[PDB]
Amino acid sequence: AGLPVIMCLKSNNHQKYLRYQSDNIQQYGLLQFSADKILDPLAQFEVEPSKTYDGLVHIKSRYTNKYLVRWSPNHYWITASANEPDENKSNWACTLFKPLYVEEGNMKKVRLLHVQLGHYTQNYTVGGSFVSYLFAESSQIDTGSKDVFHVIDWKSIFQFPKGYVTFKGNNGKYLGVITINQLPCLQFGYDNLNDPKVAHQMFVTSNGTICIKSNYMNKFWRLSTDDWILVDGNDPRETNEAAALFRSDVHDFNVISLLNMQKTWFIKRFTSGKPGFINCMNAATQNVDETAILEIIEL
Amino acid sequence: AGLPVIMCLKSNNHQKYLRYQSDNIQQYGLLQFSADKILDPLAQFEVEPSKTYDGLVHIKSRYTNKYLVRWSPNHYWITASANEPDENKSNWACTLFKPLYVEEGNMKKVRLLHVQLGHYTQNYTVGGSFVSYLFAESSQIDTGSKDVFHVIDWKSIFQFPKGYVTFKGNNGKYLGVITINQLPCLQFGYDNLNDPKVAHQMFVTSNGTICIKSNYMNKFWRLSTDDWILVDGNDPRETNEAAALFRSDVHDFNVISLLNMQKTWFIKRFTSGKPGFINCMNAATQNVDETAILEIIEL
Numbered sequence: 001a002g003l004p005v006i007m008c009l010k011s012n013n014h015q016k017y018l019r020y021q022s023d024n025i026q027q028y029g030l031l032q033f034s035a036d037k038i039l040d041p042l043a044q045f046e047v048e049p050s051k052t053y054d055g056l057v058h059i060k061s062r063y064t065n066k067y068l069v070r071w072s073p074n075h076y077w078i079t080a081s082a083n084e085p086d087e088n089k090s091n092w093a094c095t096l097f098k099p100l101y102v103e104e105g106n107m108k109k110v111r112l113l114h115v116q117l118g119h120y121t122q123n124y125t126v127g128g129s130f131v132s133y134l135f136a137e138s139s140q141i142d143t144g145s146k147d148v149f150h151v152i153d154w155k156s157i158f159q160f161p162k163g164y165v166t167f168k169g170n171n172g173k174y175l176g177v178i179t180i181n182q183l184p185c186l187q188f189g190y191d192n193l194n195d196p197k198v199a200h201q202m203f204v205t206s207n208g209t210i211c212i213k214s215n216y217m218n219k220f221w222r223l224s225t226d227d228w229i230l231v232d233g234n235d236p237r238e239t240n241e242a243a244a245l246f247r248s249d250v251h252d253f254n255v256i257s258l259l260n261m262q263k264t265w266f267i268k269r270f271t272s273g274k275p276g277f278i279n280c281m282n283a284a285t286q287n288v289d290e291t292a293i294l295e296i297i298e299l
Numbered sequence: 300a301g302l303p304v305i306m307c308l309k310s311n312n313h314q315k316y317l318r319y320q321s322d323n324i325q326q327y328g329l330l331q332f333s334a335d336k337i338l339d340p341l342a343q344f345e346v347e348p349s350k351t352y353d354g355l356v357h358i359k360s361r362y363t364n365k366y367l368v369r370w371s372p373n374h375y376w377i378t379a380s381a382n383e384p385d386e387n388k389s390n391w392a393c394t395l396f397k398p399l400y401v402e403e404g405n406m407k408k409v410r411l412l413h414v415q416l417g418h419y420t421q422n423y424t425v426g427g428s429f430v431s432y433l434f435a436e437s438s439q440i441d442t443g444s445k446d447v448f449h450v451i452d453w454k455s456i457f458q459f460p461k462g463y464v465t466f467k468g469n470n471g472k473y474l475g476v477i478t479i480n481q482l483p484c485l486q487f488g489y490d491n492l493n494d495p496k497v498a499h500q501m502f503v504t505s506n507g508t509i510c511i512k513s514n515y516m517n518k519f520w521r522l523s524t525d526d527w528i529l530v531d532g533n534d535p536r537e538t539n540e541a542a543a544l545f546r547s548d549v550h551d552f553n554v555i556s557l558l559n560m561q562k563t564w565f566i567k568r569f570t571s572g573k574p575g576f577i578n579c580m581n582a583a584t585q586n587v588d589e590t591a592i593l594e595i596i597e598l
Contacts, residue, residue: 026565082507242371
């Protein structure tokens with residue numbers, strides 16, 4: 001119904017992501033707006049379209065693989081615990097929800113109506129322990145906007161923009177081609193997004209590896225001499241040369257680290273001491289360091 | 300191919316479960332036998348039958364929802380990062396696996412053969428940082444059985460024994476029916492599993508709630524007088540009475556805590572002070588405590 005197959009929900013009211021409550025407490029099983037990162041393994045939910053009703057949806061925790069349902073005949077708290085869907089609107093355990101978009105055409109802002117009750121769900125707080133839990137409050141939209149959620153497609157966090165992009169290093173500079181000692185290097189030393197030497201193109205293969213082409217050089221990034229990432233490679237989707245294949249470690253939307261597949265080490269901003277090699281891309285760190293985090297800027 | 304749709308793999312070699320390595324380290328994305336409990340959110344995998352090859356299977360991490368594939372053309376390390384399945388047996392990125400049951404008929408002990416390589420996967424260690432990671436070593440069975448895995452169906456951990464069962468408290472005693480002051484209570488004070496009073500039956504409903512019947516009385520458990528759990532209830536599957544419904548917090552196979560849906564507090568072995576009411580089941584704890592931990596013993 002316009003929602004991603006697998007999604008994450010964020011509460012504008014306090015900026016946290018909805019996650020299954022796994023602690024051994026009274027609220028076990030309930031859904032709490034407390035995940036700091038979207039990468040939290042308890043924050044993923046799968047949406048499943050209704051068999052009978054056009055527009056109604058069933059939702060389950062990806063962790064437990066169980067449907068969201070009311071805690072019991074007496075409560076409005078939502079628990080991801082139903083073993084199976086229930087499309088009977090008169091049953092307190094009906095599992096049908098109805099996504100209602102806050103603004104026309106915008107699919108990332110929604111209010112989720114519990115069908116059986118006809119109540120909007122909210123990031124609700126009662127007292128002491130019942131803090132920030134999903135609760136089907138009433139048929140009235142909330143004055144405090146605690147019923148509006150930001151929808152996030154889980155799949156997209158691991159997808160990149162193919163089209164010109166550049167990378168911003170931790171020193172504030174953009175990554176561009178540069179010839180040093182006859183070697184076609186990559187340096188974080190450009191200030192302007194429009195310098196054509198700074199434009200790159202990311203190709204994500206079906207196996208998860210990524211290859212990157214320098215627009216300016218019209219050649220692919222390739223680990224080579226002294227572990228510098230030089231711009232001289234042929235298309236690795238044909239050559240299968242591990243030196244020109246990378247795998248990413250996503251930290252957040254457009255914030256990544258890339259491991260070079262030949263050395264299996266992360267690439268980073270590096271100054272080797274040898275004259276001329278200042279802030280150049282090199283496979284120099286076994287694990288992620290601050291000089292290894294790259295921000296992707298679309299072009 | 301006989302595997303459960305969603306499963307957890309346990310290494311025979313060191314009794315840890317296979318989980319996605321999410322730390323920002325060299326081995327990010329690889330699969331490591333380091334989860335202590337099956338409840339770890341990074342330890343669930345899903346199986347998909349091959350589209351063209353009977354008996355062949357693709358496997359993905361439930362977390363990333365990506366396919367297990369070789370790290371690169373040069374490696375035998377397995378990473379859960381393929382975007383899509385690959386059935387080309389000749390391609391290094393082939394995602395097909397062949398489960399090979401160790402004991403004919405027992406679908407729980409298995410070896411996973413990486414089809415393209417023709418190698419068995421192992422709980423592999425190459426010292427240093429690569430410790431206990433899935434690696435498709437060779438076409439030879441391992442002397443030390445590091446290639447033998449125990450398959451556990453994920454859905455079954457939230458499933459309970461049908462037919463007769465009892466419950467063992469933290470005082471080593473079985474839970475049985477007992478009349479105290481005219482009230483038909485449940486007390487942890489029997490040492491004989493053959494006592495008919497100690498026998499119960501659990502019913503899980505499609506909504507996740509559970510209702511328990513005492514075999515002896517032929518009555519369902521129900522929160523009533525002074526929060527004690529009495530055995531006098533009619534079937535809540537028909538009365539929809541919250542006091543006769545419980546939701547479980549599973550700690551491990553057959554080790555759970557139960558929350559009464561009327562009080563929304565966990566039931567535990569309890570001694571009130573009122574004479575006679577010693578070690579009786581009472582909804583007296585908000586969060587799980589030692590006394591709220593119950594062991595399900597099947598009869």
